Design a binder for these strands. Sequence first.
DNA 1: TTAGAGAATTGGAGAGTGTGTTTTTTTTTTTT
DNA 2: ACACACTCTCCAATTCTCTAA
Lengths: 87, 223
Amino acid sequence: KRNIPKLDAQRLISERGLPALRHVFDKAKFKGKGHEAEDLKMLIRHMEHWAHRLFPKLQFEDFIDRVEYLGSKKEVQTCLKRIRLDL
Amino acid sequence: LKDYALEKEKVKKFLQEFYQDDELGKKQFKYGNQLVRLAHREQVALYVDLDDVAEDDPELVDSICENARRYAKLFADAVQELLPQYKEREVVNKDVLDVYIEHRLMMEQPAELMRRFELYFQGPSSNKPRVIREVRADSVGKLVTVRGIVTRVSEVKPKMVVATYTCDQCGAETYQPIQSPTFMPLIMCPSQECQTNRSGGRLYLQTRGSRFIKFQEMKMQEH
DNA sequence: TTAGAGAATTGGAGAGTGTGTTTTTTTTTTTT
DNA sequence: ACACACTCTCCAATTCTCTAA
Ligand SMILES: [Zn+2]
């Protein structure tokens, strides 16, 4: 009863979080000099798409606030050390 | 009560083995030929004649005449189970509703949605016609024959048989078979992903996917 | 200096209760 | 049998406080 879903640290370090992020951009392409605006649009498009995988309930700005707060926890640092360099 | 599985096998045996000394006595097994035509989508309705059944099993005829609705469902399922055996050919795509079904198959790879045939009984020759005054309450549920004059007829209307919905978020589809004269539609997605995440996706009904049948109303009066 | 555990207050997710809902006979004025 | 309006409850989210890393 009352099994309310919410985005906590264990969910954030799951596969649809940072691992999926690490792999989403290796297929993308960017145009660079004089096209930075379009590259930003493409980047944000993929980022909103990815965020919706992780927790499809919040608006994107509210989701960013949750990630900004939740980034403080040691649990995500234990995964960050793997995402940076390698496992 | 009878075991309707045994009755199903008996009905299958009738369809598989009966020949009326048919096609000028050449014994070409009328219902087998009909099943070929049905499998190749040459024909839609199939009128099973109870006089043919009486040649093998009059007790089955009596079983059908009372509580006919059970045997309607039973014969329909038997025909659906036997249909692939009389198929040999691939049929051309010719209907938008079946284009949706084809897409559904392509994506997958209830039966009511696919069951594109109709099954009806032709009354036994023993049963003389009643007048509209002699169909009293002891005949509820039983197969009857009536005689009279038509007074009024409506236009042909589309009657709903099974509804098909799509979900905005998860991209899945859902089905709802209809039997009563009224129903209540669905609203919010019951699929596990939407439910577990409580994501709140809504359901949109698709007239391109759902199944409809021709329906008409009529009145008949005493001589 | 930065972060986690134990205790107190409060929002709201959810359940329960009460109630509502064409077709016939007779008269009166004015047209005939 | 199927919809509003109202009352009420228990579960657990948010912050205070004390503590260790
Ligand atoms: Zn859904």
